[PDB]
Each structure stands twice: as C-alpha cells, then as structure tokens.
Amino acid sequence: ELVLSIEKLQEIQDDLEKINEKASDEVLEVEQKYNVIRKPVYDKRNEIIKTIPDFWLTAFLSHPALGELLTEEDQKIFKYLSSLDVEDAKDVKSGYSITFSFNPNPFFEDGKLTKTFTFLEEGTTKITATPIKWFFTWFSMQDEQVADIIKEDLWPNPLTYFNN
Amino acid sequence: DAELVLSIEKLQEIQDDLEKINEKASDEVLEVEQKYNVIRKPVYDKRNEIIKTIPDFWLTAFLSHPALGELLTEEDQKIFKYLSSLDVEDAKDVKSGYSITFSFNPNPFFEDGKLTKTFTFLEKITATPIKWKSFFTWFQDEQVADIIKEDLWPNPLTYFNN
C-alpha cells in the first residue's frame, strides 16, 4: 500500500552510522597517539617562549579576534603571564583545558588560571574555570570560541601571528 | 635583537617539526578514510537499491534540502524527474578528488544516460558533455559539489520527510 521502504532506508542509514562511528574511533586513536607525541615538543617550545619577553601578549594583540578583546589594562596584566599551556583529554573526545600561568603579578592574586571544557555525549559542553582572586572576564559563556580559537588557531603556530 | 633572533629561529625549527609530525598524522587519517570508503562501498551501492523503489527520491531530497532547494529551476526539476540513480565516488586515494555521476533514464531532453562531473586535486573539473535534443549548466563554483558530497550524500534523510 504505502511504501515503508523509507524505514528500510532508515535502517541502511543507521547501519552506515556504525561504520562512521568506527572510523571516528580510529581517527580519535590517531589523534590520541599524536597528542602524546606532541606533548614533548610543545613543552620544549614553551622553554624557547620563556626567553622571548611578552611573546604571548604580542601574539594575542596581533591576532585580530582576540586582539579586539585586548582590554588594554587586561593587556598590561596579560604581559605578566609566564606561559600558556593547552592540554587535551587522554581520550581526545572528552574535553580540554587552557591554562595561563602568571609569574607573581599584581591585579591577580592567583598564580595560574585555567578554563576546562567537558563534552557531553549529546553535544552540549560544560565550561568551568578557576575562580579569580582579584575585559579578561572569560573565567567565570558565549561559546567555545575563545577557548576554541586559541586551541585551533593560535596554539599550534603562534609564530604566524607573532611576526605581523 | 641580536639574541631575540636565534630564539625566534629555534622556535621556527620547532614549529617546522610540528608541521612534519602533523603531516605524518594527517597521512594516517587519510588512510583510515581510504580504509573505510571501501567498507562503505557496498552499503551505498545497496542503498541505491532502496532508492530505486522510492519514486522521485533524489528530486525530493534536492528540493527539501535548504541549500539545494533553490538551485533547481523548473526545467531542472522536470529533468530530475527522469533520473534513475545518483552516485558519488571518492578517488582510489582520498586527497586526489571525487566524481558525481547522475544515472538518468531515457529522456526526451538529452540522450546521454549517465553524466559524470569529476573534480581532481592537483596539489581540475571535467564533465561529460551533454548531447541536447540553471543547475544543469554544470555540464569556479565547486561548492555545488561539496555540499552534495559532504551533507546530502552521506545522509539525504537529514532534511527529508516532506
């Protein structure tokens, strides 16, 4: 009468979803191995960064999007930051954290400030950050954007934005 | 400046290393794609079987899709009414390119049974010429091919049920 072959096609689509999930799992395994491979070279690059004074402030101010978020007083405060680290979860799908380490600096009583993102299986995310012991109010909503851009755009190659 | 340099250059070296590493990683990812495209070849083919039973399936999918709904003119809809099946094939590798093949039934408009539009990645778009008798102007804008490949292809039911 009425073709339920649409339901048979729904079955085929759900079947292909399993192959897609397995391929995603293998891609995640590749990225898991390579983040472990990349941890030493990033840890060594931060040593080079420490030699360059206010490297991260220059990189951020040179970046257009985050450079809009300068908040010049918060920019003078961000000049103080000792280093910047971005850690991915052991299982790369769960989440990640971004940690700004500040050597002893006024305007902030906390040495290190980090924002952690945990990914729920539905798709929504939970963003929780270290409390401030006081612009740069990103540690307290809009989207992953900031926590996103630094991870994708600035963290791998900050040098592209440094010399501009 | 005298010293501030060497440091920078060292970092450049470090950055280059990352690139190399990333390249290696990327390679493996691509391989997985290859590995699973073969795995997907039967189902997709098998999927086409079901599609042959549904009347005016791919036309309804093109129309229901918000992006490709407005691309089809009335003449293009009438031409789509005839098509038998649709196929999309990645290359033997994955970074080389892909082709989109419209297998159309005998039509009064055009004699050609199947039309293949192939994009190749040089690190090149070529179409089988129609034999006559706005979207169909396909045989710079490859998007019309990317949105078909990435969104509609894998799951046309994403915007279906109309």
Numbering used by the authors:
A (entry chain A): 22 to 155, 181 to 186, 198 to 221
B (entry chain B): 20 to 142, 147 to 156, 180 to 185, 199 to 221
Article sentences:
NRP1 and NRP2 are histone H2A-H2B interacting proteins, closely related to animal SET/TAF-1β and are involved in functions such as histone chaperoning, protein phosphatase 2A (PP2A) inhibition, cell cycle regulation, root meristem formation, heat tolerance, protection of cells from DNA damage during genotoxic stresses, and nucleosome assembly activity in vitro. We also show that both AtNRP1 and AtNRP2 are capable of nucleosome assembly activity in vitro and thus act as histone chaperones.
Based on this prediction and further alignment with the sequences of AtNRP1 and HsSET/TAF-1β for which crystal structures are known, we decided to truncate the first 13 residues from the N-terminus and 35 residues from the C-terminus of AtNRP2. AtNRP2 NT/CT was heated at 40 °C for 10 min and centrifuged at 13,000× g for 20 min at room temperature before crystallization screening. However, we were able to solve the structure of AtNRP2 NT/CT to a resolution of 3.42 Å in the space group H32 by molecular replacement (MR) method. The overall structure of AtNRP2 revealed an ellipsoid homodimer with a pseudo-two-fold axis, running perpendicular to the long dimerization helix, giving it an earmuff shape. Each monomer could be divided into two domains similar to ScNAP1 and AtNRP1; domain I, which is the dimerization domain and domain II which is the histone-interacting domain. The domain I consist of long antiparallel α-helices of the two monomers arranged in a “tram-track” fashion, which is the characteristic feature of all the NAP family proteins. The dome-shaped structure of AtNRP2 shows an uneven distribution of charge, where the concave face is more acidic in comparison to the convex face of the dimer. The offset in the dimerization domain leads to differences in the end-to-end distance of the curved cleft, and thus AtNRP2 is more curved than AtNRP1. AtNRP2 forms a tetramer assembly with its nearest neighbor. The underside of the earmuff domain is thought to contribute to histone interaction, and as the same region is blocked in the tetramer conformation, it appears that the tetramer assembly (if any) would occlude histone-binding or could probably be a means to regulate histone interaction.
